[model samples]
Target: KQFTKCELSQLLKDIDGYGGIALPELICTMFHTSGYDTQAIVENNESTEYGLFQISNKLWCKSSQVPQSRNICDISCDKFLDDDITDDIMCAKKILDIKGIDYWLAHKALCTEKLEQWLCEKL
Candidate 1:
């Protein structure tokens, strides 16, 4: 399922505790990586990225496609593609603390600019 901007904003705020990153910035990275899409999957030569936060199979989660995975998050990469994102958010926090936002290229390339535009204010 794809989330609307305000819906994602509210969900992240309540669950993520901002996780040391700004709420708006975290939401912005989500858009750039997955367009608020819970089912997004992007493949690269060495690894595949899955779900809302695009957690990778190479190091974060295990995938059948990549047998040598480190599985640092101790989850199947398939878990990230599901409609429920509670697990995905938790894994993202792990990535945030370990790899930092640079783990997501879109955030460094574009989401960092004019972050206020990503904000979803209450109606």
Candidate 2:
């Protein structure tokens, strides 16, 4: 199911702090990956870092406000929500920033193992 505006807002708030933005398609993909429900991670205040962006509070703190409680979804989406582009495009940009396009191109040249090693080296 597609997310309601409220749900989308909460999700954006949860990850905005982590510089986590994604395209809607990617968001849907992650939802499927997580069994089509983010309630446990959001409403229950779990620390699963669940959502389209796979964000964690730690990462959020690095980029945005730190909530008194670590409930990722407790934050307000109004603080970070943007309508500049579709979710997938936003996510692609974010990915490019995190993993340079050149890195992705190189991954195609090398094997997955080599790509993993390269990413580790970056970290």
Residue-wise C-alpha lDDT for candidate 1, range 61-106, written one tens digit per residue: 9999999999999999988988889999889888878888788888
Error of 2 at 101 (Å): 11
Clashing residue pairs in candidate 2 (N, C-alpha, C atoms within 3 angstroms): 22-87, 23-87, 23-88, 24-87, 24-88
Per-candidate Cα lDDT values, in order, are 0.85, 0.36
lDDT value, candidate 2, whole model:
0.36
- 26-86: candidate 2 lDDT, tens digit per residue: 3333433333343323322433343433334432312234344343334332322333224
Q: Which stretches of candidate 2 lie above 4 Å from their native place? A: 1-32, 38-47, 61-96, 100-123
**Candidate 2 residue 9 C-alpha distance from true site, Å:** 19
* TM-score, one value per model: 0.91, 0.27
Pick by TM-score: which candidate is best? 1
Q: Clashes per prediction? A: 0, 5
Q: Relative to the unseen true structure, what is the C-alpha lDDT of residue 76 in candidate 1, on a scale of 0 to 100?
A: 94
